[PDB]
Amino acid sequence: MIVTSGVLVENGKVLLVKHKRLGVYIYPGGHVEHNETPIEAVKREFEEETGIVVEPIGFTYGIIDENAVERPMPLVILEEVVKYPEETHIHFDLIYLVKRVGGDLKNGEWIDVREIDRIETFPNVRKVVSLALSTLYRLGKISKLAAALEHH
């Protein structure tokens, strides 16, 4: 099934929640409901699971008109196999980098990335967080450059 997740990193910490069934730490996310887009789903899941409101970001060519609007590219797409003694689940996970735009922390834990190698996370979470840090670094260089140009 198609699912989606959101990666929120602020001041060297990533917001993770305990997996509903496995307990291990994972980025907030869940199944995309029947008539919702993955974009709407990640926003909904993130706020229901943590109380924080986010907006998915990601590369876009900027296409927008009366016929279609482009949505941001996920940070990475992983096709995950989750085995349970009862059944195996296949999750096609659109993992988005997200930014905080409101809300307040009600559930979840801000995990210092320097400690993540001694915290039990769902598979591949650390590699994905590392991809987010690199991406955020480049986004910051672009943002700082935009600001420096505003001085003209």
Q: Does 32 bind a second copy (CB under 8 A)?
A: yes
Q: Is 95 exposed, middle or buried (0-12, 13-18, 19+ CB in 10 A)?
A: buried
> Under rule CB under 8 A, how many of the chain's residues touch a second copy?
33
| Rounded Cα gap, residues 29 and 82, in angstroms | 15
Report phi then psi at 132, rounded to 5: -65, -40
* 8-16, 63-71, 97-105, 142-150 -> range binding a second copy (CB under 8 A): 63-71
Contact between 147 and a second copy by CB under 8 A: the answer reads no
Q: Does 90 bind a second copy (CB under 8 A)?
A: yes
Smaller CB separation from a second copy, 76 or 97: 76
Of 20, 81, 88, 146, the one binding a second copy (CB under 8 A) is 81
Site for a second copy (CB under 8 A): which residue of 73, 113, 133, 136? 73
Instruction: Find residue 92's DSSP bridge partners.
Output: 2, 79
Tell me the C-alpha distance between 77 and 94, whole Å: 5
Is 16 exposed, middle or buried (CB count within 10 Å of its CB: 0-12, 13-18, 19+)? Answer: buried
Q: If binding is defined by CB under 8 A, does position 57 make contact with a second copy? A: no
Q: Locate 150 and state its tokens.
A: 């505003």
Kindly list the residues in this chain that would bind a second copy in the complex (CB under 8 A).
Answer: 1-2, 32, 34-35, 37-39, 61, 63, 65-74, 76-81, 90, 92-93, 123-124, 127, 131
